[PDB]
Structures are given as structure tokens and as C-alpha cells.
Amino acid sequence: QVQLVESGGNLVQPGGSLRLSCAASGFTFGSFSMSWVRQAPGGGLEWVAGLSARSSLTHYADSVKGRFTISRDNAKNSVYLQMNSLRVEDTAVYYCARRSYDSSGYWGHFYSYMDVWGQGTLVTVSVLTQPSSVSAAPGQKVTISCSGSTSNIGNNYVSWYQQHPGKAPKLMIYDVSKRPSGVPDRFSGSKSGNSASLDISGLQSEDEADYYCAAWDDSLSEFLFGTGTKLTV
């Protein structure tokens, strides 16, 4: 039913340009805020650009301002990212993702979480702290901490994302402690002061993946991802 489908991943020479599309189906895209999130080789999740829901208001990460243009095409029910003056450090898989309805309104920054994710497309140009890794046997309990300061985790609600390598991230926990439909109750989320926790009881082999926390930061005025934790069973 509801999905986002990306297209346009290509190889470009340095200084070249490329346009990516993010097409919605099953819902009106303009009804939601949305973002582009990139992942460099060996890197974590990085917010790059986005649109506010009911306006056409844009913003961009500092590393990308002046070179990337985000726009909506309401006629095609889609969003585009025009990438000019591309650099080698721009090489990454780029995802688009919508922000939930419930985080697209007056308290959208407090709640900011992304429920529907694009497939990811590869462009080749040629301080939320988590443990590096955690491990346990199947059936064992695991805890993944996510630490910050007042501006991020202190003020805003935390979400958690599961990513098998090279695949689209998946929302596992939102608004600190909530699970979306279908996410098993083995997963639970916690917050206390400037730290949050993802607990996984009864480790299953399919849980082996990278896990990122995320929260809005009030001083940056930017959505932050954690450095990420590799979980092995």
C-alpha cells in the first residue's frame, strides 16, 4: 500500500550533477515532512536535506547547502533532489524517508521520526554516542545505549532504526517507547535524562544488524543519528 520508491542512482565525474526522485504511492506526500538521509562507505546515517509538510520550506545540512536543491512535485506526488557540484565525499547510498504525520505538526521536532523509507539508490562520484558493537547468544538479552546532552536527547524524543548492511533502514521504536505494527515485543525503548536505551530480549539470528538511535538537536536545529552499533548473534 503506502511506499516510497527511489530512482536515479548513477556514476558521475567530480563536479557533475544528478537528479534523484522519491515517488509516493498510497498517500499524499505533501501531507508529510520528509528527508533525504545518506550513508557513505563505512559510514553511519547522515541527514542531508528535507521538506516541511504542508509548506514548501526546505533545509539542508551544512555539508550540502548551496549545491543540493530539494523540491516537491505535487503533480507527480513526489520529491526530487538535484545534486550539483558533486564531490568524492558525496559518494553514498541516498535514502528518502517521510516523517510521520504525528511528527509533521506543531511538536514535530520533539517527536521527529521516519516511518516509511525508500529502497536506497547509490551515487558514485569518481554526537549521539553508542557502543561500537554488542554480542550475545540467541535467547540472550542485549542493551544498546545512546548518550547525548540537553539539546538532543535531553529535550526530544528518541527513535531507533534497524539496518541490515546495504539495505533500507527500518523504524523499530519511536516516541521513546512505541513499537510500530509488526515489530515484535522483544524490542523495547527507554529514555532517562541525556541517555536512551534499546533493549532486545530473546536475541534472534535475524536481529543481527546495525542499530542507530536518533533525535532532534535544538542547538543545531537538525535531526541527528547515532554513531551506530553493530549487533552480532
Side-chain angles (χ1 to χ4, degrees), residues 113-114 129-130 144-147 158-162 170-177 188-190 195-199 211-214 229:
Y113 72 91
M114 338 208 302
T129 307
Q130 315 178 38
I144 296 175
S145 62
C146 170
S147 308
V158 177
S159 43
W160 292 88
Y161 302 86
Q162 177 191 254
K170 173 174 170 51
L171 206 219
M172 303 297 280
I173 293 293
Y174 66 91
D175 287 346
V176 180
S177 54
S188 60
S190 212
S195 62
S197 278
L198 179 71
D199 284 82
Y211 293 81
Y212 301 87
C213 61
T229 298

Side-chain angles (χ1 to χ4, degrees), residues 210-222:
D210 291 302
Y211 293 81
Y212 301 87
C213 61
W216 187 262
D217 184 288
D218 292 321
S219 70
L220 266 21
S221 302
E222 205 150 282

Side-chain angles (χ1 to χ4, degrees), residues 52-100 103-105 107-198:
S52 61
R54 184 266 323 141
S55 320
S56 281
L57 266 159
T58 65
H59 212 215
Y60 306 91
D62 290 357
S63 60
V64 128
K65 281 174 54 39
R67 308 150 52 216
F68 291 16
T69 311
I70 195 172
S71 61
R72 58 201 339 152
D73 187 328
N74 299 134
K76 297 188 109 298
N77 197 9
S78 59
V79 172
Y80 295 102
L81 186 64
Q82 179 66 231
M83 304 167 81
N84 297 155
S85 301
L86 284 155
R87 317 167 160 157
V88 177
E89 324 92 88
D90 293 328
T91 293
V93 34
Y94 287 74
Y95 302 93
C96 68
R98 78 127 107 108
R99 283 167 50 182
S100 58
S103 74
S104 292
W107 294 335
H109 296 344
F110 285 113
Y111 295 132
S112 188
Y113 72 91
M114 338 208 302
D115 48 1
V116 185
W117 285 73
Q119 32 149 159
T121 203
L122 212 218
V123 179
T124 305
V125 186
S126 67
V127 7
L128 310 190
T129 307
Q130 315 178 38
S132 265
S133 62
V134 287
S135 285
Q140 294 277 276
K141 172 183 151 297
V142 161
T143 301
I144 296 175
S145 62
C146 170
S147 308
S149 55
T150 304
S151 270
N152 33 250
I153 297 179
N155 290 355
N156 298 110
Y157 290 14
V158 177
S159 43
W160 292 88
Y161 302 86
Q162 177 191 254
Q163 194 194 22
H164 300 284
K167 313 281 275 296
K170 173 174 170 51
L171 206 219
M172 303 297 280
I173 293 293
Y174 66 91
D175 287 346
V176 180
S177 54
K178 281 183 149 296
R179 274 182 286 115
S181 309
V183 178
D185 74 5
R186 294 194 292 98
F187 297 88
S188 60
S190 212
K191 191 204 191 204
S192 183
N194 298 134
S195 62
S197 278
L198 179 71

